[PDB]
GROMACS .gro file of C-alpha atoms in nm:
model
  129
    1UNK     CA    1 -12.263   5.644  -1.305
    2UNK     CA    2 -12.608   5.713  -1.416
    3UNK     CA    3 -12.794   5.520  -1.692
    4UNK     CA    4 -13.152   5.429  -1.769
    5UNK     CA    5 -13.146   5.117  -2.019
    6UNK     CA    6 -12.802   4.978  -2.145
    7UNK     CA    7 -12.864   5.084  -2.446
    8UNK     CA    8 -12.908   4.895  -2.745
    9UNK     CA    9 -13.272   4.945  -2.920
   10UNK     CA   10 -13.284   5.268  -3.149
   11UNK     CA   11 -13.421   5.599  -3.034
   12UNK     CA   12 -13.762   5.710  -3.064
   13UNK     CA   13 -13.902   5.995  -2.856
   14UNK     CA   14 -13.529   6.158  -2.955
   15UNK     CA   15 -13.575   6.015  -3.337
   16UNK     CA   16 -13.749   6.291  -3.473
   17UNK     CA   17 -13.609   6.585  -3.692
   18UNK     CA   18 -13.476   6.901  -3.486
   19UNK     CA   19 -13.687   7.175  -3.516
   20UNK     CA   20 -13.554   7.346  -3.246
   21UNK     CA   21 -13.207   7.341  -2.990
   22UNK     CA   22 -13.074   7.553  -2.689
   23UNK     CA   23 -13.069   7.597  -2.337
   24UNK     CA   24 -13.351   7.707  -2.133
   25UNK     CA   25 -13.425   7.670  -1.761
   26UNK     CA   26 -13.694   7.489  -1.615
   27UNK     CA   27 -13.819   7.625  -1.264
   28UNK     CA   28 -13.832   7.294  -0.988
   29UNK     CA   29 -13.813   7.330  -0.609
   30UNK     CA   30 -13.513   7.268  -0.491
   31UNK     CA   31 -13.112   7.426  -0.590
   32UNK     CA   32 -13.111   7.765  -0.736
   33UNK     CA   33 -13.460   7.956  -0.824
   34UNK     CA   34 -13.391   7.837  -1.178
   35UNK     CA   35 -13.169   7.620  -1.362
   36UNK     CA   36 -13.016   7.612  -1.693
   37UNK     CA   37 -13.099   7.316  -1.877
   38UNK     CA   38 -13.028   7.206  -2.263
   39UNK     CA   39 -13.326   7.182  -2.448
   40UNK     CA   40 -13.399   6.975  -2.744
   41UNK     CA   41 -13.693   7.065  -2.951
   42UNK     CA   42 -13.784   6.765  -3.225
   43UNK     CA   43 -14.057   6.688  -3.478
   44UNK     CA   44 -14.186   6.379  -3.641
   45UNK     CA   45 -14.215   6.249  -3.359
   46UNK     CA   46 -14.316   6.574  -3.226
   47UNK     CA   47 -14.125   6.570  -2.846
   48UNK     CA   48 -13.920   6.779  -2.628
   49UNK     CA   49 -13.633   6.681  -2.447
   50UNK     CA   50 -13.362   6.865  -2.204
   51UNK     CA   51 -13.038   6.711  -2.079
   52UNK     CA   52 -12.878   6.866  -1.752
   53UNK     CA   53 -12.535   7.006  -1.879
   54UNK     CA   54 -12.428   7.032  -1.493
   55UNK     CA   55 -12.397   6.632  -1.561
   56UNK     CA   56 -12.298   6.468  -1.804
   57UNK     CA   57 -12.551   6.186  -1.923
   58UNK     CA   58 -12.649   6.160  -2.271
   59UNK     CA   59 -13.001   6.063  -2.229
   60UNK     CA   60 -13.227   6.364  -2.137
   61UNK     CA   61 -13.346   6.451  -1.791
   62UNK     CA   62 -13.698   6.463  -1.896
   63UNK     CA   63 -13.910   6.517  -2.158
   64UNK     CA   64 -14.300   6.551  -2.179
   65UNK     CA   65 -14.520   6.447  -2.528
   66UNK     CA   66 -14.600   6.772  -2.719
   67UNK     CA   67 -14.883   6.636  -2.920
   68UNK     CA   68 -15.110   6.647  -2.638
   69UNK     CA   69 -14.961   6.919  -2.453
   70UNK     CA   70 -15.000   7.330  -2.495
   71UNK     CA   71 -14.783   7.643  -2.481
   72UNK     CA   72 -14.833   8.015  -2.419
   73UNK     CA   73 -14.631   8.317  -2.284
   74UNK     CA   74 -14.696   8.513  -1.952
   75UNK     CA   75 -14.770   8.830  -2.020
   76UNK     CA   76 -14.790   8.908  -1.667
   77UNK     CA   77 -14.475   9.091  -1.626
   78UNK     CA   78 -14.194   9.023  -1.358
   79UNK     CA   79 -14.370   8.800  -1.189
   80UNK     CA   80 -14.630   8.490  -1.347
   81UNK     CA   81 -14.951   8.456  -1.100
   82UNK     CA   82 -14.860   8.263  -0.830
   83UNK     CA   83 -14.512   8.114  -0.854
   84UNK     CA   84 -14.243   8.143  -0.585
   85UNK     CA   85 -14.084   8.463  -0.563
   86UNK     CA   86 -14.046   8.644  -0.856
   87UNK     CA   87 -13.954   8.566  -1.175
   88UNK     CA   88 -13.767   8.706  -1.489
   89UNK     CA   89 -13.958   8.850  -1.788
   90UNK     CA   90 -14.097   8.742  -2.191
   91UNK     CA   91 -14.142   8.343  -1.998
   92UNK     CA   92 -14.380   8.063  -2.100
   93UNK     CA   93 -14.559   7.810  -2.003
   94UNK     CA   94 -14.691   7.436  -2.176
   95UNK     CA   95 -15.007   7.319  -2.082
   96UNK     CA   96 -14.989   6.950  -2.076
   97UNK     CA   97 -15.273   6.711  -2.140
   98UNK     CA   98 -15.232   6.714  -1.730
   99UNK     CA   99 -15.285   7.101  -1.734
  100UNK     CA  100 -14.965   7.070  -1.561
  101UNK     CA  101 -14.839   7.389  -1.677
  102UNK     CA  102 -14.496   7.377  -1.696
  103UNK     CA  103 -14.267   7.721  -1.637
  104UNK     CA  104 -13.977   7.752  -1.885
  105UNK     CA  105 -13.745   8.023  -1.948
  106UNK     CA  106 -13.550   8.103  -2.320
  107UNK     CA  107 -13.239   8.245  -2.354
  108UNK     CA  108 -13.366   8.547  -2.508
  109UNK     CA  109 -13.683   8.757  -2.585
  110UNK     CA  110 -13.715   8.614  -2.907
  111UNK     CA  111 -13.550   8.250  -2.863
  112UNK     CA  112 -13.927   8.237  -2.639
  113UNK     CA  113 -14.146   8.343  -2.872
  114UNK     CA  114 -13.959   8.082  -3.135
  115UNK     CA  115 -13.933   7.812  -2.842
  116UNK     CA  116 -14.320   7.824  -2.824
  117UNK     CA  117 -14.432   7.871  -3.197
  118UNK     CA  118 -14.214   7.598  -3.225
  119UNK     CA  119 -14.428   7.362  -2.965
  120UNK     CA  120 -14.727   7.501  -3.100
  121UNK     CA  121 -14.601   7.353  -3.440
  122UNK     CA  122 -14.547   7.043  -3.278
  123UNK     CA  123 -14.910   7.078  -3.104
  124UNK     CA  124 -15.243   7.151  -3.196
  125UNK     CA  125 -15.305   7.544  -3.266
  126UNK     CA  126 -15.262   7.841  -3.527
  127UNK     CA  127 -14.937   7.798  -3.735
  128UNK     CA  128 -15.095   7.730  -4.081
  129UNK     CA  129 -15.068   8.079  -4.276
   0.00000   0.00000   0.00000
């Protein structure tokens, strides 16, 4: 089985209103180039979560704070700057409070550019107007 805490406190990081759902996929070493992976998108608190839908585990695989974190798009077609191989195209990246920079992938064109105006939201930047 698989199971963090037994569960019996109320959520937090996952108690805040959905400002955003699908799947996206997250590029990590290891298995296939990229993998699908359902993300949440939440505000108030303002987080991001993604479950692995290959398992099946209710609590999330991850999830980084958005308050303190970035996100942009990579123009650079096909492939980012420097990342293995080749990837596919309209992608974006979230500059953490680590400058991390972490690679994501949405389901469309458009589901991207929503996927990151959404963080943004979440985040500090130009929303207002």
């Amino acid at each position: 089985g698989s199971s963090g805490s037994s569960g019996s406190l109320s959520t937090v990081e996952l108690s805040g209103t959905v400002v955003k759902q699908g799947y996206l996929a997250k590029q990590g070493h290891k298995r296939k180039n990229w993998k699908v992976r359902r993300f949440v998108l939440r505000k108030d608190p303002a987080f991001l979560h993604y479950y692995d839908p290959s398992k099946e585990e209710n609590r999330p695989v991850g999830g980084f704070s958005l308050r303190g974190s970035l996100v942009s798009a990579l123009e650079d077609n096909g492939v980012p700057t420097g990342v293995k191989g080749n990837v596919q195209g309209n992608l974006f990246k979230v500059i953490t409070k680590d400058d991390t920079h972490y690679y994501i992938q949405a389901s469309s064109k458009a589901e991207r550019a929503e996927w990151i105006e959404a963080i943004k939201k979440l985040t500090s930047g130009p929303s207002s107007g």
